Symmetry: D2
């Protein structure tokens, strides 16, 4: 009952981290709108979970997002929390293999889609003293190899979270982000499957964490529910869900 | 029921943040041991809360802490979480007004008392795959005026949290800290009461936060319960409970 | 003679921070190419400084940047350092007053122009074991009010610096950024001139720093020369030139 | 001539990082006082370098430090910069192998010795608008394995730097720190020599840096000279000299 009577929109909610966050909010008593650009995962989740419904919506299409918000209000009467989870990590790319145009397209999903849904939802969040939760990445803060565009988009999301927190604090609307590290999702599986030795790449990923495993969507989901329902003095924070990967010295390559 | 069947020790649990953390864990289903060097607050809390009991213990006295741990095991059979909250902020002191000896004494409470209880408890935490929660401070990270010794002790606690997280991760024991900002407690009230204009000093404190108020012990308590009971992929993190005070530009004093 | 025999390109070098960085490198013995989209400041600087020359170039125009690099090599035979300083801060804008299209345009200057010149220059920097210096902002790290797009662009530049540092470290090319705080430049003057009380706005800006003044272009310039010429074990760092504005509590707005 | 006419005290100046910093300041035109508790390195450096002199002084002995300051003034007439470099890293120690008393002793050197010389020197630094430079460590910020006491002492030094910067900014005295990563010094050599496979331990240390080597005392020295002589808008900063070890994912140990 931690978030009973509340209404939550989760973008990219059809699989992976997004689906874990959907399940965490339903388990807390909330009604959830699943936004995804793909029908398959999200429609099945709608049938599985009483309290969850699916709305097809590509967050890079402004008119899809407008409809997403107006249907959430029409069907449920309020809006309390937006979770900006939709995003993509391209396959590893050397810097000279990137293009300005590929970079713009990635900014369009990972940064501007978050911006657009946040903007269209804030009027309703102000009425409910609701809150925004953005899913950034640890690599926005510490960097990552062969991912200059991805890393730059997540640096922007984390910084944007802090700016918007400042602007919305007079209106009682909190704005926070979660920076996951290696979480085991279908995207992680798909990227590993492209590599010469998928299993070695997955072993590498597990051991980047002092805890020796990757994280789960449910753990990101629990962090989200905490920010929504219990972190009433937290705004502009970056909550790390990484298993300790940012800690200590490692293998990154006498004087 | 989030932490039902679990056993928690909270130091400095007799008032303020500590008492808020006690109440949050009892509300989550846990049995709580209240450690304090003063009898008055903690003994009343024992009578108020079924599931909480009080043990007199000065965390700077190694034999007090040994007894604290051995009695917790004798009375309850396990130990799942230690919350190192006991600590002190001296009145504002200019750097030339401090002494090496006053600095050592403050290190004794704010740093070594945390170290000692953590050390004596870890054998039992390893058996339970338990966890450690240290209460540091935002000012360890950003600094504070007229508090060189205090600030240095909290910088040490935050760094120590990360080192210990590294060492204990192979054994499944998580180690995290919470860095509160301005929280309204009897210590805050006592320091304000020493100033020329107490009410102006309290107004200043409220407005250091974008949210325009100070935080509450219950909010620190909710953050603690989250780290204990739900943050299973978090270790070595610093969870900010500050109301946004670290964000943006302020008044800190053409080219 | 700290950077004698070296060749440096500075974007936005015609006034402000950029012109200060130009002067610092000429004073260190280097030959400098001044890139700017406006002729007036940069052409005068060319006549003033032996060792500096001016090339008209809009960093958002890919063919301008290609020509910038190919002329630097044709005229001087090598390229040792690129300083990505060109950028803009819009007037203060509430979040609901921003647009996706204005945000894209700002990303085009502050982020993609840096990306494009870095990309076209890296082949030559690899040959010289040269280095990249990006001019980000403190507000990328701590946020700023009424500047969601600006803040997001500088968060991206700081994160991008760390990713590129990773990728270029095997080739001996260092990549670092400087995050200035309030520096007194014609842009600062222009923004203050838009406000109801320009002088009060400038007083506010000075007092956001513990040092009680704003910074100077020459101080950013000295930091740049240090990174280029002497910081041979520094890569991926963010060098703060802020006067302490990120330190301590301030005025950002009982429990 | 960058620091000509200036007078600098360097603690632990007899070898390693300290000796590198001594040489960097002499090369910049300054007169340097070498403080060390051991005679051998520092006395030879006095004979080697015109402009450097040696004063035996254990920074944990308050009366040694008082004499250090009063002799610097008596012999040279002013004091412009203090570099708090003296410090120690114990051999790797598991947390249950540490003691409260060993922890206190390490705090005495790495933290309180810095505090004491800073305190006795500040009157003279105020007269000269001088500055303080503390040598902390990257591991204060990111943690390190088997070094809970060491890590906590450096967390304290970095935080103390920011607090003191705040307090001294009205008087025009800047206070900054350098956080080196793996630097190749006699202490590094001595610790490696204790390990089962010294050469493997040294290879590990080199590859913790994206740059693939350890740093040199001269590079820390150049960073020090920059902070003293050219970073007039920098206070309370932490200048990383680490070769990128804090960047990206590494080896720190499916969901
Ligand atoms: N997996 C990790 O290790 C990891 C780590 C850090 C951050 N993240 C972030 O977490 C988020 C989710 O990652 P994931 O691993 O679960 O990914 P995923 O690919 O497994 O699932 C992402 C979901 O978002 C949807 N989506 C993609 N583009 C969309 C669009 N334009 N409109 C609507 N929905 C869209 C997909 O259809 C999919 O259902 C992303 O923002 C990612 O950057 C992931
Ligand atoms: N109040 C704030 O704004 C704030 C902000 C940041 C951090 N903190 C930290 O939070 C913690 C609690 O602060 P608070 O404001 O509630 O303080 P408080 O003074 O109101 O209460 C602290 C409690 O700890 C007890 N205590 C003190 N010394 C002890 C010892 N040696 N052994 C056992 N118990 C001891 C006291 O008796 C008291 O019951 C401290 O570690 C403090 O540094 C507080
Ligand atoms: N002034 C500050 O307080 C401050 C603080 C933090 C960061 N910064 C950053 O420092 C940099 C310089 O700022 P400033 O205050 O000197 O600004 P400024 O406006 O005074 O000068 C910027 C220069 O860049 C040029 N420029 C703009 N767009 C360009 C383009 N497309 N191509 C080429 N040149 C272009 C302008 O013509 C001008 O000569 C910017 O990146 C800014 O974000 C400034
Ligand atoms: N070597 C590294 O990788 C590294 C990395 C990060 C930080 N550091 C820090 O750099 C500093 C210097 O380290 P180093 O590797 O050159 O060490 P080092 O052992 O090689 O030399 C340190 C010097 O300090 C002197 N010293 C020790 N105790 C003293 C005391 N009580 N009074 C006066 N002098 C004293 C020693 O006699 C010696 O000459 C230390 O503060 C250390 O924590 C070193
Ligand atoms: N270039 C070496 C190399 O094998 N890189 C690889 C290989 C496989 C991966 C699988 C998934 C992810 C991923 O999406 C990801 C990971 C961490 C993040 F913090 C984050 O935001 C995203 N990254 C991978 C990176
Ligand atoms: N020197 C100006 C001045 O009036 N300072 C003052 C005045 C009154 C205070 C009342 C309480 C506290 C306090 O305990 C505290 C605050 C914030 C922290 F992050 C933290 O760890 C502790 N600090 C105060 C600081
Ligand atoms: N919304 C209150 C309000 O008066 N804001 C204002 C008013 C005037 C300014 C003048 C200039 C700047 C500026 O360009 C700037 C400053 C700091 C940065 F770290 C940075 O990257 C850029 N910012 C200003 C911000
Ligand atoms: N426990 C594994 C293990 O072999 N650790 C080891 C082994 C050998 C070392 C040699 C020297 C140093 C050292 O003094 C040091 C290094 C980095 C720092 F940022 C810093 O402040 C200090 N640390 C070492 C750590
Ligand atoms: Na349903
Ligand atoms: Na009870
Ligand atoms: Na010229
Ligand atoms: Na000499």
């Amino acid at each position: 009952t931690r978030y009973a009577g509340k209404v939550v929109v989760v973008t990219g909610g059809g699989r992976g981290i997004g689906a874990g966050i959907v399940r965490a909010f339903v388990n807390s008593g909330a009604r959830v709108v699943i936004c995804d650009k793909d029908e398959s995962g999200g429609r099945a989740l709608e049938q599985e979970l009483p309290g969850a419904v699916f709305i097809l919506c590509d967050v890079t299409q402004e008119d899809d997002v407008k409809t997403l918000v107006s249907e959430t209000i029409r069907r449920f009467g309020r809006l309390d929390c937006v979770v900006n989870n939709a995003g993509h990590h391209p396959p590893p790319q050397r810097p000279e293999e990137t293009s300005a145009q590929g970079f713009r397209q990635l900014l369009e999903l990972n940064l501007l889609g978050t911006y657009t849904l946040t903007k269209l939802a804030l009027p309703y969040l102000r009425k409910s003293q609701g809150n925004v939760i953005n899913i950034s990445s640890l690599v926005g803060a510490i960097g990552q190899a062969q991912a200059v565009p991805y890393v730059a988009t997540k640096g922007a999301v984390t910084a944007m979270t802090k700016a918007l927190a400042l602007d919305e604090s007079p209106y009682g609307v909190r704005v926070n982000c979660i920076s996951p590290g290696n979480i085991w999702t279908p995207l992680w599986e798909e990227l590993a499957a492209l590599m010469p030795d998928p299993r070695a790449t997955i072993r590498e990923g597990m051991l980047a964490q002092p805890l020796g495993r990757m994280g789960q969507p449910a753990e990101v989901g629990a962090a989200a529910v905490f920010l929504a329902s219990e972190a009433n003095f937290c705004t502009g924070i970056e909550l790390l869900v990484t298993g300790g990967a940012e800690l200590g010295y490692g293998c990154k390559a006498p004087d």
